[PDB]
Design an enzyme around this catalytic site. Structure first.
Site, short mmCIF file in Angstrom:
data_model
loop_
_atom_site.label_atom_id
_atom_site.label_comp_id
_atom_site.label_asym_id
_atom_site.label_seq_id
_atom_site.Cartn_x
_atom_site.Cartn_y
_atom_site.Cartn_z
N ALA A 20 -60.28 -45.79 -12.49
CA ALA A 20 -61.62 -45.20 -12.54
C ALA A 20 -62.33 -45.23 -11.19
CB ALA A 20 -62.48 -45.88 -13.61
N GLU A 21 -62.32 -46.37 -10.51
CA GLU A 21 -62.97 -46.45 -9.19
C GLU A 21 -62.31 -45.51 -8.17
OE1 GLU A 21 -64.25 -50.24 -7.64
OE2 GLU A 21 -64.59 -49.44 -5.61
N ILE A 22 -60.98 -45.54 -8.11
CA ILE A 22 -60.23 -44.70 -7.18
C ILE A 22 -60.43 -43.19 -7.41
CG2 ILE A 22 -57.91 -44.06 -6.31
CD1 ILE A 22 -57.27 -47.17 -7.15
#
Lengths: 123, 132, 125, 127
Positions: free
Chosen positions: C48-50
């Site tokens: 999700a962050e990437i």
């Protein structure tokens, strides 16, 4: 009169569009205003936790009470404290122990004011 | 009597530790109490989480504004809360904050809501946006 | 190979409706597994962050790079460490210094596995 | 090697303090942990938090239940260059019969707070 009532949450309706969903309005007065003249974020958080609790209980139909366990909110756009906002919910998880509600707070132009996730404990 | 005033936030103070005196990175904290009535209640007679959430966002904003003093005004951008223990809606709760980040554009507060016996009721993080 | 490479994110595209959205796949293998045999929630967090960062960078056109600022996740359903999951995002806020991404991670049956919101700081490059 | 091993989490331990449960750990950094600008990938820190929280919960309930991350909240406060190591220290805020809530601090070599992360674990019987 308590906080829930003074928030003035109107036209609350929980419905299957199974995918459970809810929708409601909050009529805005001076009660909801922070010092700068905008809608207070705290009012929006309260709206989301309450209507999520109401919506979870209506699905249970006597079997359990809903109790807020965690809540996350992002205040995206400032709303001048006037007129009304809509709080629309979508049930992400219909679990045995928990309900997870994705809640969108929008103004009269459908501009997203706040996005809020509420996890309810099912007691 | 708007929501803020009806919340009955008392004993608000923002302060630094005496230790932070000679250091560059000052450690900022706030303290406060909220005196409970039926106003703060949820259907089963406990403290409503919405009231605690509002207490956290409001005190964080007050603390941020006090730290800045005219330099900037603080606006709630983000809030995360975990409700750990139930509080019967009577007496009072404490809200205590620790500033985890004194950024140029954001303040990040770590806020513990505790009952009169220091039992942790809710743990809350507030991110404020800092406006010129 | 770093973590990003080994996470095996495929079919990443950002598309407009402006409403900015993205879709992608994460291909699962032993790399992603926690000890009981499930997809490691930490792998989904990372995904999700990437991908939020990847999607913001694609919008930025070199003017800035995205740096993950805050992340909120709910792991909703179990997923066995096999096959793939989809990561699909929606830009809730296209701000000048922040992007807010609503990311839904679903299995191949579109069962919602995790829901994640990511706020990216937009730092000038 | 899987993700958990390649994350290189070391010096893990769970202990009690003045009945308050805490954990302590390190993550040693290589370019495995890096994002494109040379900073520590926030995703690595997220995973560090979920893993260690899970490990610490399982070390308490050994082995009545399995710990499974239910919700996680992270604020990445300060960027770190992808070099050396970070510390991950957790505090058990709630020791429930069904849920654990860990407050986790990720700091650098000098104890500058890099990220603050809260992990809520579901406690599920086995069996």
């Amino acid at each position: 009169m308590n906080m829930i009532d003074q928030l003035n949450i109107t036209d609350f309706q929980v419905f299957t569009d199974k995918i459970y969903k809810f929708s409601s309005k909050m009529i805005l007065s001076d009660f909801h205003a922070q010092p700068q003249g905008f809608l207070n974020g705290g009012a929006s958080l309260a709206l989301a936790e309450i209507t999520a609790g109401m919506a979870s209980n209506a699905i249970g139909s006597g079997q359990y009470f809903a109790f807020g366990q965690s809540i996350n909110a992002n205040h995206l756009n400032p709303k001048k404290c006037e007129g009304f906002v809509n709080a629309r919910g979508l049930l992400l998880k219909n679990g045995k122990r928990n309900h997870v509600w994705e809640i969108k707070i929008t103004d009269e132009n459908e501009t997203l004011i706040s996005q809020i996730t509420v996890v309810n404990a099912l007691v």
